[PDB]
Amino acid sequence: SWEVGCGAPVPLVKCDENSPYRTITGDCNNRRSPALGAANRALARWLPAEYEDGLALPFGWTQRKTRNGFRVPLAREVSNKIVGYLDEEGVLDQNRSLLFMQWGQIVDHDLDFAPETELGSNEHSKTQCEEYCIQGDNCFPIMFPKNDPKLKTQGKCMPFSRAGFVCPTPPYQSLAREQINAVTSFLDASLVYGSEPSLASRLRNLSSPLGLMAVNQEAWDHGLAYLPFNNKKPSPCEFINTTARVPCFLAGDARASEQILLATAHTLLLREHNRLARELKKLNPHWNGEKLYQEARKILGAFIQIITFRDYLPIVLGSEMQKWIPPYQGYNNSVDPRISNVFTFAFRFGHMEVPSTVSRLDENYQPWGPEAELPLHTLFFNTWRIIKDGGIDPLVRGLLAKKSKLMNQDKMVTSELRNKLFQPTHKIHGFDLAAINLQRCRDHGMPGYNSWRGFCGLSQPKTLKGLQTVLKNKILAKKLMDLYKTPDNIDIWIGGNAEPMVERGRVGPLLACLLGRQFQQIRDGDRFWWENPGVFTEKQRDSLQKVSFSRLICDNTHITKVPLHAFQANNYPHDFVDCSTVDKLDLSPWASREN
Ligand code: HEM
Ligand SMILES: *[C@@H]1O[C@H](CO)[C@@H](O)[C@H](O)[C@H]1NC(C)=O
Ligand SMILES: *[C@@H]1O[C@H](CO)[C@@H](O)[C@H](O)[C@H]1NC(C)=O
Ligand SMILES: *[C@@H]1O[C@H](CO)[C@@H](O)[C@H](O)[C@H]1NC(C)=O
Ligand SMILES: *[C@@H]1O[C@H](CO)[C@@H](O)[C@H](O)[C@H]1NC(C)=O
Numbered sequence: 001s002w003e004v005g006c007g008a009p010v011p012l013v014k015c016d017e018n019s020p021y022r023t024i025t026g027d028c029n030n031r032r033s034p035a036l037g038a039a040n041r042a043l044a045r046w047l048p049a050e051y052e053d054g055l056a057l058p059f060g061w062t063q064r065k066t067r068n069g070f071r072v073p074l075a076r077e078v079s080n081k082i083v084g085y086l087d088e089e090g091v092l093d094q095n096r097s098l099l100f101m102q103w104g105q106i107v108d109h110d111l112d113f114a115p116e117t118e119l120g121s122n123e124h125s126k127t128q129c130e131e132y133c134i135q136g137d138n139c140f141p142i143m144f145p146k147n148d149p150k151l152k153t154q155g156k157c158m159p160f161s162r163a164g165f166v167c168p169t170p171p172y173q174s175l176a177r178e179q180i181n182a183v184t185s186f187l188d189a190s191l192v193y194g195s196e197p198s199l200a201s202r203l204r205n206l207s208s209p210l211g212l213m214a215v216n217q218e219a220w221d222h223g224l225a226y227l228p229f230n231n232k233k234p235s236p237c238e239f240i241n242t243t244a245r246v247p248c249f250l251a252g253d254a255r256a257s258e259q260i261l262l263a264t265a266h267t268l269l270l271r272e273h274n275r276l277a278r279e280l281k282k283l284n285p286h287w288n289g290e291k292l293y294q295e296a297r298k299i300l301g302a303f304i305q306i307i308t309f310r311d312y313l314p315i316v317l318g319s320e321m322q323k324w325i326p327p328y329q330g331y332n333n334s335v336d337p338r339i340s341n342v343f344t345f346a347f348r349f350g351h352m353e354v355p356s357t358v359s360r361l362d363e364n365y366q367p368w369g370p371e372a373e374l375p376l377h378t379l380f381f382n383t384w385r386i387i388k389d390g391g392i393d394p395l396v397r398g399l400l401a402k403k404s405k406l407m408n409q410d411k412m413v414t415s416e417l418r419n420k421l422f423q424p425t426h427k428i429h430g431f432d433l434a435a436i437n438l439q440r441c442r443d444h445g446m447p448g449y450n451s452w453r454g455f456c457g458l459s460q461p462k463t464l465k466g467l468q469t470v471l472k473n474k475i476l477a478k479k480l481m482d483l484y485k486t487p488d489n490i491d492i493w494i495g496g497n498a499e500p501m502v503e504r505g506r507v508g509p510l511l512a513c514l515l516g517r518q519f520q521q522i523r524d525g526d527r528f529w530w531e532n533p534g535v536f537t538e539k540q541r542d543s544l545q546k547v548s549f550s551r552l553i554c555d556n557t558h559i560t561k562v563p564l565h566a567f568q569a570n571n572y573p574h575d576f577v578d579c580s581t582v583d584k585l586d587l588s589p590w591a592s593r594e595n
């Protein structure tokens with residue numbers, strides 16, 4: 001009966017068992033269960049999947065099969081009546097830099113990725129889905145409600161393909177459909193180095209023995225390195241401007257060019273590896289390429305861990321932080337470090353932190369050129385605006401001096417994402433991330449809002465007035481009840497995100513509980529955690545506690561004026577101090593003693 005069994009598409013890997021380095025796949029982290037938290041296995045189920053047919057059909061598939069006696073609302077109707085807003089005045093977060101939003105996307109991309117099924121290649125099925133809006137198999141299109149302005153302009157539907165699932169990726173009947181996590185569950189910089197050998201080697205410089213990561217040979221940022229291009233076709237970064245013909249970037253994660261500020265962040269992280277690999281050589285000229293790579297990799301993975309757990313999670317979770325992520329008490333090998341299916345939705349609170357524009361700023365933190373500020377939607381899959389228009393430095397200044405959007409019950413998701421999203425294969429800046437999120441909840445068999453409230457030991461509202469008391473909002477609760485008819489049926493992404501934020505944080509109680517658990521588990525369940533005794537030397541760890549996002553920018557750009565605390569709102573030159581002030585990474589404790 002014990003289904004430890006199923007998992008056909010995985011090349012079972014032997015473990016070295018006393019190696020000082022993480023694998024690329026994340027395999028061999030846990031000794032008793034070596035697959036635990038490895039890429040290309042099922043997302044963990046904190047609660048049983050919920051499907052129309054108990055097995056695989058998403059709720060809403062059959063237009064006649066109620067959920068608890070009620071029809072589920074169209075995702076695009078929920079989007080339009082709740083998530084959407086016109087007025088970008090008053091929407092900005094007075095105490096979060098745009099870097100707060102950006103770091104979130106980075107950590108999300110380190111932890112999880114459930115890609116679309118690849119069944120449709122050399123087929124018209126993707127076309128027949130998009131072209132004809134015909135629900136079938138892995139085609140689950142987002143249909144427009146009547147009165148939707150997109151009806152008049154785009155067609156009857158937005159296209160949507162169900163996420164990949166384990167064992168068979170085609171045939172019928174499994175305990176329940178389980179979607180894949182294609183990256184490593186550990187906070188291990190997999191987004192820089194890859195989660196597969198195949199890509200991890202292609203990423204590396206294997207012409208020389210300095211342990212360097214490949215760099216662009218076509219283009220340079222004032223002598224500073226760019227990510228190598230991705231010479232695969234069709235390139236969506238080419239598609240968005242066929243005259244510039246600047247391809248998408250190649251990184252450890254396939255998503256690195258989805259928007260110019262994520263591509264930017266990816267560029268900071270690569271340089272930091274190269275900068276480390278050449279410093280390690282300096283001190284230890286006797287070291288080979290492999291040793292340099294792995295030893296640079298290991299520093300960077302520690303860096304992301306510290307920035308995330310010390311700087312980021314306290315200003316997400318606020319008052320709830322200590323309650324879910326109590327201070328570190330060493331490696332526990334009985335902790336599941338796997339990313340849960342519900343986490344990959346919980347973390348999409350990020351979508352309401354994305355504001356409608358991006359600025360480029362000069363060395364005086366003033367407007368860079370006559371189109372310094374641009375709409376978010378023109379920067380999907382846009383690498384040319386980096387190559388042909390100032391390098392990363394003017395964009396890294398905008399991440400310091402501009403603001404994240406604040407979540408708002410009346411202003412959830414900017415139209416730049418809710419109406420104008422571009423997706424690689426489809427042709428138009430005409431999609432809805434909110435609608436996508438909701439269809440995806442259903443596709444993944446997500447339990448409803450009260451199941452999750454129940455799971456987190458929170459009250460479970462059954463009426464309008466219960467829902468009003470929890471949401472502290474009569475109109476939002478009303479619109480929700482009008483759409484869902486019972487709070488039991490509310491899709492967890494919007495249910496969770498409707499909740500007012502906890503003191504000193506940027507999520508409500510339900511999210512703080514779901515996020516809190518997951519981040520506690522990936523820290524506690526990780527054999528290679530930086531503070532885990534025996535991973536670093538006690539001296540290396542005093543050197544490590546001094547890292548800052550301030551310093552990473554200083555070391556890896558030509559910017560000399562930084563805030564101390566890069567995630568809080570910071571204004572220039574008041575909150576901006578010189579780079580010689582911040583603190584460095586002393587790499588002396590990595591000095592190799594031959595004797
Ligand atoms: C301009 C900014 C962003 C864009 C354009 C964007 C776009 C997307 C898209 C297209 C998806 C795939 C949706 C699906 O097919 O179901 C997605 C998923 C996701 N996004 Fe965002 N996003 C942005 C910012 C963020 C931020 C700031 C965070 C977190 C703080 C975040 C977290 C996620 C997560 C967790 C997923 C699911 C990934 C997975 O496990 O498959 N995103 N995003
Ligand atoms: C590898 O490193 C060498 C020396 O640093 C450099 O000249 C070369 O361009 C690099 N190769 C690639 C493919 O990036
Ligand atoms: C295309 O990129 C080129 C730079 O090669 C730029 O001059 C042009 O204005 C861009 N056009 C669009 C539509 O993005
Ligand atoms: C701004 O954010 C930081 C980070 O949470 C916090 O400690 C600080 O008290 C906040 N300041 C104001 C004035 O809100
Ligand atoms: C390890 O975690 C389990 C459950 O995850 C818990 O019961 C136990 O207290 C922990 N054990 C140690 C050794 O920390």
Ligand SMILES: [Ca+2]
Nearest residue numbers: 110184186190
């Ligand atoms: Ca990872």
